[PDB]
From Swiss-Prot:
Record lineage: Eukaryota, Metazoa, Chordata, Craniata, Vertebrata
Full-protein interval shown: 1 to 89 of 172
Protein name as catalogued: Cold-inducible RNA-binding protein
Highest taxon in the source lineage: Eukaryota
Major place of residence: nucleus
GO BP: mRNA stabilization; positive regulation of mRNA splicing, via spliceosome; positive regulation of translation; response to cold; response to UV; stress granule assembly
A single GO molecular function term of this UniProt record: mRNA 3'-UTR binding
Post-translation changes: Methylated on arginine residues. Methylation of the RGG motifs is a prerequisite for recruitment into SGs. Phosphorylated by CK2, GSK3A and GSK3B. Phosphorylation by GSK3B increases RNA-binding activity to the TXN 3'-UTR transcript upon exposure to UV radiation.
């Protein structure tokens, strides 16, 4: 097929990584994404029964450019001899509030 406008440019900060090796943990990822740029936090989705690892995760970056900066690097990279991919994940979070005065 042939696409016209090749460019989303709608990064929010979170990245969508898939095909992560079981070994790949919240730390490993960071250790890598850290060499590319700054990181805010990591999130490795897991099952509810075995609670091991679904097979994908997401690393939150301070700002937008911060993430996209690393995406252009990981996007189609090999972490420890793998073939995972990286691209704009999107925006997914739940509201939350906390006390101030006590």
């Amino acid at each position: 097929g042939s696409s016209g406008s090749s460019g989303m440019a709608s990064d929010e900060g979170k990245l969508f990584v898939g095909g992560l090796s079981f070994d790949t943990n919240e730390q490993s990822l960071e250790q890598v994404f850290s060499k590319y740029g700054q990181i805010s936090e990591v999130v490795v989705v897991k099952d509810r029964e075995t609670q091991r690892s679904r097979g994908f995760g997401f690393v939150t970056f301070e700002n937008i450019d911060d993430a996209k900066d690393a995406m252009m690097a990981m996007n189609g990279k090999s972490v420890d001899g793998r073939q995972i991919r990286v691209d704009q994940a999107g925006k997914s979070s739940d509201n939350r509030s906390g006390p101030s005065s006590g």
